Amino acid sequence: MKLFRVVKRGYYISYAILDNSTIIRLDEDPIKALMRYSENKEVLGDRVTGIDYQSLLKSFQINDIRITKPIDPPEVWGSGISYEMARERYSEENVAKILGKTIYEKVYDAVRPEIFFKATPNRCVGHGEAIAVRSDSEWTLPEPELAVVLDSNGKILGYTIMDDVSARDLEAENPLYLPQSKIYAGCCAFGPVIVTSDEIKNPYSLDITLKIVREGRVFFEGSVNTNKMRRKIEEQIQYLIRDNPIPDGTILTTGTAIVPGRDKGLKDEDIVEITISNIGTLITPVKKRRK
Amino acid sequence: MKLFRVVKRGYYISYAILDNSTIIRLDEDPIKALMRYSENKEVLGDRVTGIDYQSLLKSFQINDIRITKPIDPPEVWGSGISYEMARERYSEENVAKILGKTIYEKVYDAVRPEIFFKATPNRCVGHGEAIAVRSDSEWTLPEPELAVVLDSNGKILGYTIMDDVSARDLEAENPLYLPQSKIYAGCCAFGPVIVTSDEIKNPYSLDITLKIVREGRVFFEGSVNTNKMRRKIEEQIQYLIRDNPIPDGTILTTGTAIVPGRDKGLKDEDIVEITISNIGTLITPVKKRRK
Amino acid sequence: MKLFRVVKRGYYISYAILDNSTIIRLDEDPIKALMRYSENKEVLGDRVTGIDYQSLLKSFQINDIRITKPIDPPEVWGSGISYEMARERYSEENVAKILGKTIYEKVYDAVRPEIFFKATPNRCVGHGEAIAVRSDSEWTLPEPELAVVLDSNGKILGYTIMDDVSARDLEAENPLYLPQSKIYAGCCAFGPVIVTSDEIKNPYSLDITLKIVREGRVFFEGSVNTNKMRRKIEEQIQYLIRDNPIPDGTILTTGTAIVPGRDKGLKDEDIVEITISNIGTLITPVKKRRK
Amino acid sequence: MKLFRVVKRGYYISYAILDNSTIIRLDEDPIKALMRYSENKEVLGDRVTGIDYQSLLKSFQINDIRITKPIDPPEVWGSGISYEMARERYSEENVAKILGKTIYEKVYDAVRPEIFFKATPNRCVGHGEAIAVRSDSEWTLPEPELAVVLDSNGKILGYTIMDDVSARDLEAENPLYLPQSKIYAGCCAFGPVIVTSDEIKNPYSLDITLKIVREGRVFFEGSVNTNKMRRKIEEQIQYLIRDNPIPDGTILTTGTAIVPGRDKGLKDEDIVEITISNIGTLITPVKKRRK
Ligand SMILES: [Ca+2]
Ligand SMILES: [Ca+2]
Ligand SMILES: [Ca+2]
Ligand SMILES: [Ca+2]
């Protein structure tokens, strides 16, 4: 089951597409619906015709309906430095270093992984909506990541593509500015669908691809496979929920491995495209904030 | 106007006490009520007898009613290193240092202050309720702070006492563990009231006092005045709201200056008392989390 | 307990006055509150000062608050011809008569009493609000009645004064026009309070008094005691609920004995005052409907 | 557009069927949807497959879904003696008569028609649900009628089949018992659909057919056309709304012309079938009330 939501005349409608192309309109709340499918694979609703899912991915935006965030995640959390060579996060001399070793390569080795609060639902956007660059950021990058939808017990309800938009220049300036660099209006994008757990046989065998498009020009292209992930997801979830209750429908984003250069910073009207196998391609335009 | 809330048989009731001891039961939502008083100093409700405010502060807990969080703040944010000598936050050789200067004494000097996400409402507790020490923390300290209640425009609606409970050992281990050290169940306490802006003539002239009580024993006592605050509140608010929309009733906590030693770590059944002039005294028992 | 409601800036507030003059602001819904007092005589709320109940009865209407319908009764039902000499309801030759005996004097004798649907809540008005005379009625009279508040099981939750406003000329024209004569906008008034069952020792010993006031002039005055009621209330309730479920807070009005003459018909700007012992006096101005 | 509702696992879903057999699942409230179609003939929703409307009419009741009342009418009103020869309503000597002429043949002639309150929504049932015979009624008949759905201005939003279930023996006993004979649990049935105004070209040219089925046996069969209606619907609506506000979705039932005999009274387990051209056939089992 691949799950998506549209906004129509002020109200939401949620639809699920099956492997045989049949589209089902949902009766329940999408988060409630994912929790159901997790237990017994049951879906409540009616089969619908005249809903062009493929056109929605391309155009947005057809007649009356517009695709958006598939769910409203009550909390979005992030997990840092889970990949090979992710330690070199700003290799300039010098960043923050404890006993000669940098803070980022410390966490890569340490038992306890990095976990940070990323966004509230109203700070998130969906497929076809604009992500943002802070007014006071000269170097902001998109971070293409595999993200999991969780229940209150930390059980994986599904997978999605997430863009952890990071004002990298503020982070490099001082690690204590990380929250300012990560948490703002339009700092987070996910979609276009949330695939159910059974739609992906192996989460550690998926192709993530980033493309930044500036006036038709491919400004950056890079891709990495999930087999390069060292810190496993189950461990990230374990440290997330420890003494820390999360609501149903929490999204955890698993960290990035595709890092564009110092010159590849985002600017107004850019088009960020992220592709993950079996899920789809998330396309979000970029909007530079005015001071 | 000094504003407080009680829970009674599953439902909330909000009361306001005036300077002449008269107590008013509120008609509106407390956050909505603070926004009103901010504009024209109007209070909607009836004067009530038989509500013993002084007994509520001491006992909790009288007949049918129990004092709790005065409001439900949709978001709680924190501001770090705003005081003199707050730079020495773990002076051990070495913590995180950029170009020989430590990250904490960098922020003290830098134009951009430290701002971090602290808690969601359900992670907060009130007067007489238990704060928590993480199951995996050997050194957790309370941080006595002056806190402001804000509207969506960043206007100060009122003041309160806040305990920013911090698992200091995890922070010292690596600054990237800060979110884990700060954000958890029972990580935050505030109250017992929210005083309106006009109840404090000068916010930079208030006595903050910390007391940790272990089996009747005064385990720690320290106090500092707000005149020692270098980073002004208006500046902290400015950087909080920048490209970052906050809901009505957001609490910002302004940073601490009272820091107990390495030996003064919290443990089960402790009693943390925090006093700020004109506001009152916040008393919260301590509960150690089981693994 | 004597229960009343006020409207204040678009919202309702319910208050209860006790025998020792102490006034309590209610926590619960008034219908829910009456059901509670019926079981264990418990009242949830706070004692309030500055609520001038006596002034509310006279003026309406003080500062911010206006008295209105004490509850919103989901259904209002009526019971006809329960009094001595009520058989002579329009003695003119002739009204509707079966086998030489008139339909009204038939019901007075018959095992089965008269029960009719009277109003929906939005068709009812309260103390100080305007009752109405239909645009096509030349002879409309008020019917001063003792009314009971019922739960779904038909248990008496309390007593109130009710005005069953009846377009008597339409009824006399044809008994099948009774629903048109009884059910319309402003066809029903009750209040000013609902007294709890224990406030009246004997419901069959109460003085009901009607007064129609035209420009300061006492246009009609009449009064009768409830000891003149032949058809008992418990029997009226029995036939009401039979195969007919009623919601909680249903009002049953027990029939009238004070009937003004053919010349004493109501007209615009009249003042109808109804008094019942231990309850109070219900005052409603009259408003003639335009065609 | 022909509109119907189903109940599924505790919640309602509304569907519309078009003339070309295409079935649309509705986005809006059915009453809100009828008001829309009345203004511009616009329908909000998605075309659905796998909803077997024809099977729903026969079986009820398929898998997960059960047909019921197409809407929840806030008020149901009735209009009496609108047909030829309807004057002979119980011709026995004697019923209620004014000046030698019977009350029923008076209303047939009089300018003012008969209008009565019939039911609240919770007293109504739908296609496939049980209608009721009062525990104290020895002669109860179904009254097959054309019914209109109205808005607050008295505009016709659509048509449906309605059964005005009447305890005829109580009415014959005394006309003042009419409310008891008409208003009770399961006193009213309508459906199976509500057809939009444009689905019927001429409301005064429709075949209404009654069938009472006792253990497979056709116990009664009778039918009459709407061209035999003397009192027009527009006039019935006019007298309904006069000084009497009705909510959106009010149903008015236009009176019957098919009257079974004194021996044809209803009893337990009977099957009452009513057919009106272009609308469908309403089938409701009968359930005798226990004392
Ligand atoms: Ca990231
Ligand atoms: Ca702090
Ligand atoms: Ca009456
Ligand atoms: Ca009828």
DSSP string, D33-96: HHHHHHHH----EEEEES--HHHHHHTSEETTEEE--SS--S-EEEEE--BTTGGGTT-SS-S-
Going from the Cα of A28 to the center of ligand 3, the distance in angstroms, rounded, reads 49
d(CA A148, CA A162): 9
| Cα nearest neighbour of B11 on chain C | C27
Domain CATH for B7: 3.10.330.40
Domain check: are D227 and D241 in the same one? yes
Tell me how crowded residue C259 is: count the other CB atoms within 10 A of its CB.
20
Longest Cα separation, chain C: 63
Asked which of B26, B50, B70 is the last residue of a domain, the reply is: B70
Angle formed at CA D233 by CA D228 and CA D234, multiple of 5 degrees: 140
Stated resolution in angstroms: 2.8
Contacts of B183 (CB under 8 A, 6+ apart): A117, A244, B117, B118, B119, B123
Closest alpha carbon to A182 in A76, A37, A289: A76
Query: Which of B4, B29, B46, B53 should one mutate to test binding to chain C, selecting the residue with the greatest count of C CBs within 10 A?
Result: B46
Closest ligand, as measured to the CA of A145: 1
Closest alpha carbon to B171 in B144, B141, B145: B141
Say if A49 is an interface residue toward chain D (CB within 8 Å). Answer: yes
Say if D201 is an interface residue toward chain A (CB within 8 Å). Answer: no
Domain check: are D272 and D287 in the same one? yes
3-state SS record for chain A: CEEEEEEECCEEEEEEECCCCCEEEECCCHHHHHHHHHHHCCCCEEEEECCCHHHHHHCCEECCEEECCCCCCCCEEEEECCECCHHHCCCCCCCCEECCEEHHHHHHHCCCCEEEEEECHHHEECCCCCEEECCCCCCCECCEEEEEEECCCCCEEEEEEEEECECHHHHHHCHHHHHHHHCCCCCEEEEEEEEEHHHCCCCCCCEEEEEEEECCEEEEEEEEEHHHECCCHHHHHHHHHCCCCCCCCEEEECCCCCCCCCCCCCCCCCEEEEEECCCEEEEEEEEECCC
Domain check: are D58 and D84 in the same one? no
Domain check: are B127 and B253 in the same one? yes
Domain check: are C257 and C130 in the same one? yes
d(CA D208, CA D63): 32
CB contact under 8 A, B174 and A107: yes
3-state SS record for chain B: CEEEEEEECCEEEEEEECCCCCEEEECCCHHHHHHHHHHHCCCCEEEEECCCHHHHHHCCEECCEEECCCCCCCCEEEEECCECCHHHCCCCCCCCEECCEEHHHHHHHCCCCEEEEEECHHHEECCCCCEEECCCCCCCECCEEEEEEECCCCCEEEEEEEEECECHHHHHHCHHHHHHHHCCCCCEEEEEEEEEHHHCCCCCCCEEEEEEEECCEEEEEEEEEHHHECCCHHHHHHHHHCCCCCCCCEEEECCCCCCCCCCCCCCCCCEEEEEECCCEEEEEEEEECCC
Distance from CA of B17 to the nearest CA of C (A): 14
Closest alpha carbon to D187 in C117, C178, C181: C117
How many contacts does A have with B, using Cβ atoms within 8 A? Answer: 106
Q: Which two tokens stand for residue D223?
A: 């039918």
For A14, A59, D40, the CA distances from A63, given in Å and listed in that order, are: 17, 10, 18
Residue written as tokens 């959106």?
Answer: D248
Domain check: are D276 and D152 in the same one? yes
Domain check: are B263 and B237 in the same one? yes
d(CA D248, CA D29): 12
Say if B9 is an interface residue toward chain C (CB within 8 Å). Answer: yes
The domain in which residue D46 lies consists of 1-70
Count of domains for chain C: 2
Q: How many CA atoms lie within 13 A of C204 on its CB side?
A: 10
Domain check: are B153 and B13 in the same one? no
Q: How many CA atoms lie within 13 A of C266 on its CB side?
A: 33
Closest alpha carbon to A33 in A167, A164, A241, A193: A193
Tell me how crowded residue C285 is: count the other CB atoms within 10 A of its CB.
15
d(CA C109, CA C87): 10
Find chain B residues with C-beta within 8 A of C25's C-beta: 25, 46, 48
Domain check: are A84 and A53 in the same one? no
Going from the Cα of C118 to the center of ligand 3, the distance in angstroms, rounded, reads 9
Annotated binding site of A for substrate: 81, 182, 256
Q: Which of D177, D239, D243 sits opposite C289 (nearest CB)?
A: D243
Cβ atoms C131, C236 nearer than 8 A: no
| Cα nearest neighbour of A289 on chain B | B243
Cβ atoms D286, D108 nearer than 8 A: no
Cβ atoms A285, A125 nearer than 8 A: no
Contacts of C238 (CB under 8 A, 6+ apart): C154
Find chain B residues with C-beta within 8 A of C47's C-beta: 48-50
Cβ atoms A43, A22 nearer than 8 A: no
Q: Which of A75, A98, A180 sits opposite B95 (nearest CB)?
A: A98
Say if B150 is an interface residue toward chain A (CB within 8 Å). Answer: no
Cβ atoms B117, B138 nearer than 8 A: no
Distance from CA of A162 to the nearest CA of B (A): 20
Going from the Cα of B190 to the center of ligand 4, the distance in angstroms, rounded, reads 66
Cβ atoms D175, C103 nearer than 8 A: yes
Say if D248 is an interface residue toward chain C (CB within 8 Å). Answer: no
Q: Which two tokens stand for residue D61?
A: 């009741």
d(CA C108, CA B227): 87
Cβ atoms C78, C250 nearer than 8 A: no
Asked which of C70, C97, C129 is the last residue of a domain, the reply is: C70
Q: Which two tokens stand for residue A97?
A: 């270093």
Cβ atoms C15, C191 nearer than 8 A: no
Sign of CA dihedral D82, D85, D90, D92: positive
Q: Find out whether the peptide bond into C94 is cis, omega within 30 degrees of 0.
A: yes
What is the dihedral angle through the alpha carbons of B6, B9, B10, B14, rounded to the nearest 10 degrees?
-20
Residue written as tokens 């500062």?
Answer: C63
Instruction: Give the A window 71-90 contacts with B, CB below 8 Å.
Output: 75, 80
Cβ atoms B51, B17 nearer than 8 A: no
Q: Find out whether the peptide bond into A122 is cis, omega within 30 degrees of 0.
A: no
Chains D and C: 3 or more CB pairs within 8 Å of each other: yes
d(CA D52, CA D133): 32
Going from the Cα of D69 to the center of ligand 2, the distance in angstroms, rounded, reads 60
Sign of CA dihedral B249, B255, B259, B264: positive
Find chain B residues with C-beta within 8 A of A177's C-beta: 112, 114
Domain check: are B116 and B45 in the same one? no
Report which DSSP code applies to C290: P
Residue C284's SS3 state is strand
Find chain C residues with C-beta within 8 A of B44's C-beta: 9
Backbone torsions φ then ψ of D204, nearest 5 degrees: -95, 25
Closest alpha carbon to C174 in A211, D116, A159, B129: D116
Domain check: are C172 and C265 in the same one? yes
Residue C241, H or E segment: helix C233-241
Cβ atoms B146, B228 nearer than 8 A: no
Contacts of C141 (CB under 8 A, 6+ apart): C165, C166, C168, C259, C260, C264, C265, C266
- Using the CB atoms, write b or e for B212-230: b if 16+ within 10 Å: bbeeeeebbeeebebeebe
Say if C18 is an interface residue toward chain B (CB within 8 Å). Answer: no
Q: Which of A106, A122, A176 sits opposite B107 (nearest CB)?
A: A176
Partners of chain C (3+ Cβ pairs below 8 A): B, D
Bin D200: left if φ > 0, else alpha if -120 < ψ < 50, else beta: beta
Domain check: are B105 and B228 in the same one? yes
d(CA D5, CA C255): 41
Distance from CA of C86 to the nearest CA of D (A): 15
Sign of CA dihedral D193, D198, D199, D203: positive
Parallel/antiparallel/unpaired status of strands D188-196 and D2-8: antiparallel
Angle formed at CA C34 by CA C30 and CA C36, multiple of 5 degrees: 115
Backbone torsions φ then ψ of B109, nearest 5 degrees: -85, -40
Closest alpha carbon to D191 in D159, D152, D164: D159
Asked which of B35, B70, B105 is the last residue of a domain, the reply is: B70
Contacts of D6 (CB under 8 A, 6+ apart): D12, D13, D14, D15, D56, D65, D66, D67, D68
Cβ atoms A240, A154 nearer than 8 A: yes
Say if C35 is an interface residue toward chain D (CB within 8 Å). Answer: no
Tell me how crowded residue A281 is: count the other CB atoms within 10 A of its CB.
16
Angle formed at CA C255 by CA C16 and CA C187, multiple of 5 degrees: 70
Contacts of B162 (CB under 8 A, 6+ apart): B145, B146, B147, B188, B189, B190, B251, B253
Going from the Cα of C124 to the center of ligand 4, the distance in angstroms, rounded, reads 27
Count helices and strands in chain C by DSSP H and E runs: 6, 20
d(CA D77, CA D252): 5
Residues less than 5 Å from ion ligand 2, measured at CB? B 143, 164, 256
Q: Which amino acid is at C2?
A: K
Query: Can you list the positions of beta strands (E) in chain C?
Result: 2-8, 11-17, 23-26, 45-49, 61-62, 65-67, 76-80, 97-98, 101-102, 114-119, 124-125, 131-133, 144-150, 156-164, 188-196, 207-214, 217-225, 250-253, 271-276, 280-288
Q: Which of B98, B184, B289 sits opposite A96 (nearest CB)?
A: B98
Residue C16's SS3 state is strand
Distance from CA of D46 to the nearest CA of C (A): 37
Q: Which two tokens stand for residue B275?
A: 């006093």
d(CA B161, CA B180): 23
Backbone torsions φ then ψ of C234, nearest 5 degrees: -55, -35
Domain CATH for D131: 3.90.850.10
d(CA B59, CA B160): 20
Name the structure determination technique: X-ray
